[PDB]
Amino acid sequence: QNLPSRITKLIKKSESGDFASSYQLYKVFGSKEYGVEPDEKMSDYFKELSAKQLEGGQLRVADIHLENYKGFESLIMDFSMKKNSTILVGNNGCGKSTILDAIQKGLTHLSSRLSTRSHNGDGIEKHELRKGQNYASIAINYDYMGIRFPMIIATTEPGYEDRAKSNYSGINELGSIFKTAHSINPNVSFPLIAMYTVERANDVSTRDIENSEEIKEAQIWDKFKAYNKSLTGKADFKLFFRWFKELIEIENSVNSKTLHTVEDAMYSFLPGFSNLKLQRAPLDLIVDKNNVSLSVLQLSQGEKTILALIADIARRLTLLNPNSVNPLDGTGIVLIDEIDLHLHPSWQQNIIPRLEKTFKNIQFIVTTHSPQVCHTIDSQNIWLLKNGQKFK
């Protein structure tokens, strides 16, 4: 056990509280880092101590690399930690969808370890190669508490299995730490993994959800539920209707404050609304339109899309985050594709600042076309694209 003074310094820092030192030492003991060599059988008091001191960490992507995916030949994107917002502006032909929907592939594999069954969700498909190459690769570097996590989703084509191979060596531990933390305590907060594609507005209506619509089955409202159907890109308002019914039925303070917080999440957004109630009789959900009357089946599609999006995000953050003062302060990644979809042009100047105002702990990697989306965004947050190339 050759112990440098750095080992003792990191040990003292870990006692004071720092996940980074704990995970670094858990790698050190059992390896050759500063010698030492395997001392304990496994995770003596280092990985378990990290799991105990697992709180407040943000699951944020830091570096992605595309190699012959979609129409590209090579791409090296660089996000940042101090800024919780990434906006990808370009045109149809210069792929920012091949950035968002290239990160969702790795996010599916992370979802299938974070809290679900361990299984490979998506891989690189033949309709994804650049019509003529044989090797493809997407690399993602998750950064939790300041420690990197490699990902290689590289595929192969027959006859060329020599330099491309998948390596899930970081997400095999990023989820294991969370499982250990959940073993330590049951009320730990897991991050949110979510993508929202162009199809957000699809299936947002109370058509027959008061009747046979496949939600009639009993529902288990645990922490693992919010991870189901998250990376399909469709906002679930029908399930929000089920949750809203259940919470108000129980309401008739801890069982009531959730709906108040979720509703105030929307009220801080698109204005003029208050006192949203249901219809026990076979009518539609009712919401105010500057205090006369209105229902949800009769709305504007900007209202509809914003309502569905924010309802889904708030409901998943409430499920994922256990009893806490502010359940909406959860961490994770929320991918919004085509954010400039059905919003009046005076909204595409406040949609992003309010998203990072109310839900102010989640990185938002969004894609847009209208320049007005960038009107409230610094120049360093913007990534222009042209002919498979990235400009500042």
Place this chain on the structure above:
Amino acid sequence: RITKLIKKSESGDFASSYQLYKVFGSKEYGVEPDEKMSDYFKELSAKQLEGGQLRVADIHLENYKGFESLIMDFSMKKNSTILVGNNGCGKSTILDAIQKGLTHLSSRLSTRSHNGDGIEKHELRKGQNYASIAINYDYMGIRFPMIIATTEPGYEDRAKSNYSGINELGSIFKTAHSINPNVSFPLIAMYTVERANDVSTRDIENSEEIKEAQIWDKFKAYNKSLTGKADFKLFFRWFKELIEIENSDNSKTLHTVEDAMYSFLPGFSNLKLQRAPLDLIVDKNNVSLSVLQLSQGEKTILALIADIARRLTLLNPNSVNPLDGTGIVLIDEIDLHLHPSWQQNIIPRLEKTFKNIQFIVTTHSPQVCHTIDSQNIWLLKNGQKFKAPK
């Protein structure tokens, strides 16, 4: 007996021919109702509509949706009108009223004889009890009234329904069909905010509803046209039929409909068909992708233009140029899935390719209203028709 109105009897244009039915037929006011030249004039005013145009004159909305009362006169000299506004002002309400009137018009024009949609419970203003959707049509200078109005029961008939004009329009079109079985039926279609959504080839095969033989006639263009979905699967089936004939040649329709799509696209070419997986080939920048392998903005417009081209192709069978048809085509959210720069060429390409189609479109992007006449812009802000034509 007869005044100088023998002028209109000088075999005048369709305006005079139709005006010599209402008078000079029945009504016993002007000339004795002989009833013979009335039938002869109905027969005459069927071949006269060789180069006619169908537009919408003006609409009256009263308590339908948010609008308490609004009257706008759609200019007919210009073949395009734009309804710019924010969200919550009533751009789609104006379009949805015309879509509930065009349903009744298509019910008479198509092989249908029954009626269509109507005002229902939810689509009536909160507090009031009578609705009013009056759409006045014009066909070669003749004005055709319409009133789709219904009211809640218990009141002394404050509103009623009158369907006089569209019956006459359908009658004259049917009479035109009886003589020459190609009379350039006007196109009726709304394109809602949910175009595309079915422009993927992930599933198109023998396992879906597009498997039975479908009759290609001018009445086929009225199926699901007002629903608001770009029926790309049926276009794929039609394209398979047309390419099969070209392979059987061992057919200028395909060239025309394909050149219609290339014009709207900045460097797309060479649409062919894959036989094994059944998906469409497209060549951008001379690298061959597949129809599913584009952007949503490069697929929505592809489906939209392909659909419009095929509807005019079936609707004007024997015309030398099938795209020179007439219609009341509506697009909601034209700026959807478009560049800040492609929102410029979107209107002129429609104007050049479709020179006799009226486009009552809605948008909220300022970049769409460039190079467009200022007197065709309807800013429906608040609850009126505040116009900014300078």
